[PDB]
Design a protein around this ligand. Structure first.
Ligand SMILES: Cc1c(F)c(Oc2cccc(C(=N)N)c2)[nH+]c(Oc2cccc(C(=N)N)c2)c1F
Ligand SMILES: [Ca+2]
Ligand SMILES: [K+]
Length: 223
C-alpha cells in the first residue's frame, strides 16, 4: 500500500496473510473454512495466517492454518490476468472471534464513485522498496470503466475494475496481491495487477468479485 495509513491491529479482521516461509500475498476469509485470493498467488504449500497485525511478531491473536486444497478459476489466463481469483480450503475451521471475522460476498456489483478499503502488507514506496510489518489501509474509489480502459488499452476485461487516484500517489502494490477490496461491507475486489505503483494515470486493477459469486458458492458447497 502506497500513501495509506496504519490500520490498527485487527481492525481488518477478515484479512489473511498467505505464507510459504514468508508472506507472499494477501487473502480474504469468507467463512470458517475458505479464503479467496488471486490466482496469480497460486503456490504449493501455503499456510494461511489469520488475526495478524505485525507479520514478524507473534502478538497473541494469530491462528496459523495449513491449506488442504487450492482451486484456481477454470478460466484463469496467466498472460492477461483475466479471472485472477482462487479459493483456498483451510485444513481445519478457523475460530471466529473479534479479531478473525469473515467478509460477506456481494449480492450486486458496485458503482463507480463507491468508496472502498484496500489493505495489505505490500510495498509502501512509489519507486523504491520498503515493506511494512504492520497492515496498511487505504480508502479509494472505484473509477469509471472508461478511465480504466483509457489507462490500459485493450487489457481490461469485464472481470476487472480500476480503483485508486488518477493523479497517482495512492495505490495498492506488490505484496498486496490477493488482498481484499471492501465496499459497503461486501468483498468487491481482489488486488490483481497494476503498472508500477501510485503512478499518475495508472490506477490499480482488481478482479470484480461480483461476477464470481455463483462460481464461489457452487465450488465451496462441493469441496
Ligand atoms: C511485475 C509486476 C507486474 F507484472 C504487475 O502486473 C501484471 C502482472 C502480470 C500480467 C499483467 C498484465 N497486464 N497482463 C500485469 N503488477 C506489479 O505490481 C503490482 C501488483 C499488484 C497491484 C499493483 C498496483 N499498482 N495496484 C501493482 C508488478 F510489480
Ligand atoms: Ca503477528
Ligand atoms: K504481486
Amino acid at each position: 500500500i502506497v500513501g495509506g495509513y496504519t490500520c490498527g491491529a485487527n481492525t481488518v479482521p477478515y484479512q489473511v496473510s498467505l505464507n510459504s516461509g514468508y508472506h507472499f500475498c494477501g487473502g480474504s476469509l469468507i467463512n470458517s473454512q475458505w479464503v479467496v485470493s488471486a490466482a496469480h498467488c497460486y503456490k504449493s504449500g501455503i499456510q494461511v495466517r489469520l488475526g495478524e497485525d505485525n507479520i514478524n511478531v507473534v502478538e497473541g491473536n494469530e491462528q496459523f492454518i495449513s491449506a488442504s486444497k487450492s482451486i484456481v478459476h477454470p478460466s484463469y489466463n496467466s498472460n492477461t490476468l483475466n479471472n485472477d481469483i482462487m479459493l483456498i480450503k483451510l485444513k481445519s475451521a478457523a475460530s471466529l472471534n473479534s479479531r478473525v471475522a469473515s467478509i460477506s460476498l456481494p449480492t450486486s456489483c458496485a458503482s463507480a464513485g463507491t468508496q472502498c478499503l484496500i489493505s495489505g502488507w505490500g510495498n509502501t514506496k512509489s519507486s523504491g522498496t520498503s515493506y511494512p510489518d504492520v497492515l496498511k489501509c487505504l480508502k479509494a474509489p472505484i473509477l469509471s470503466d472508461s478511465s480504466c480502459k483509457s489507462a490500459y488499452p485493450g487489457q481490461i476485461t469485464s472481470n476487472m475494475f480500476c480503483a485508486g487516484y488518477l493523479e497517482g500517489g495512492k495505490d495498492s502494490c506488490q505484496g498486496d496481491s490477493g488482498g481484499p477490496v471492501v465496499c459497503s461491507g461486501k468483498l468487491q475486489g481482489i488486488v490483481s495487477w497494476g503498472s508500477g505503483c501510485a503512478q499518475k494515470n495508472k490506477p490499480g486493477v482488481y478482479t470484480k468479485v461480483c461476477n464470481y459469486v455463483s462460481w464461489i458458492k457452487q465450488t465451496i458447497a462441493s469441496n
